[PDB]
UniProtKB/Swiss-Prot annotation:
Residues included from the entire protein: 1081 to 1197 of 2442
Disease annotated for this entry: Chromosomal aberrations involving CREBBP may be a cause of acute myeloid leukemias. Translocation t(8;16)(p11;p13) with KAT6A; translocation t(11;16)(q23;p13.3) with KMT2A/MLL1; translocation t(10;16)(q22;p13) with KAT6B. KAT6A-CREBBP may induce leukemia by inhibiting RUNX1-mediated transcription. Rubinstein-Taybi syndrome 1: A disorder characterized by craniofacial abnormalities, postnatal growth deficiency, broad thumbs, broad big toes, intellectual disability and a propensity for development of malignancies.
Post-translational modification: Methylation of the KIX domain by CARM1 blocks association with CREB. This results in the blockade of CREB signaling, and in activation of apoptotic response. Sumoylation negatively regulates transcriptional activity via the recruitment of DAAX.
Subunit-structure text: Found in a complex containing NCOA2; NCOA3; IKKA; IKKB and IKBKG. Probably part of a complex with HIF1A and EP300. Interacts with GATA1; the interaction results in acetylation and enhancement of transcriptional activity of GATA1. Interacts with MAF and ZCCHC12. Interacts with DAXX; the interaction is dependent on CBP sumoylation and results in suppression of the transcriptional activity via recruitment of HDAC2 to DAXX. Interacts with phosphorylated CREB1. Interacts with CITED4 (C-terminal region). Interacts (via the TAZ-type 1 domain) with HIF1A. (Microbial infection) Interacts with HTLV-1 Tax, p30II and HBZ.
Official protein name in the record: CREB-binding protein
Amino acid sequence: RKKIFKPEELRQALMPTLEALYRQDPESLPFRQPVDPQLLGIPDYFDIVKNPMDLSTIKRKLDTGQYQEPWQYVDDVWLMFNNAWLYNRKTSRVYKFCSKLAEVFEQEIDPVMQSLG
Ligand SMILES: CC(=O)c1cn(C)c2ccccc12
């Protein structure tokens, strides 16, 4: 029989992994709010990043039952990373900070995924 997830239980299981990302200081700072290309003066951003994602949007989704399965949450976290790694220079602050968050995410998401299945 296939496992089905209750919204508050999926939120409780995944939230610690999101909190771990959000608490990285300074590395979460470029990711705590959506990229605003108008405010940052980068009109080319949405020509490269078709599906923006950031930590505040991931949290708002985890809080409002928008993830039905844990892998939809994992997909959004990787989308945030892959956007940053495509747009930014490899030794830029944003790219280096992204790679730190991805290290933290990998080290934390594995037991949670095993425990959820
Ligand atoms: C997440 C991301 O790509 C970026 C976040 N900030 C604050 C930026 C500033 C310039 C270029 C890219 C970004």
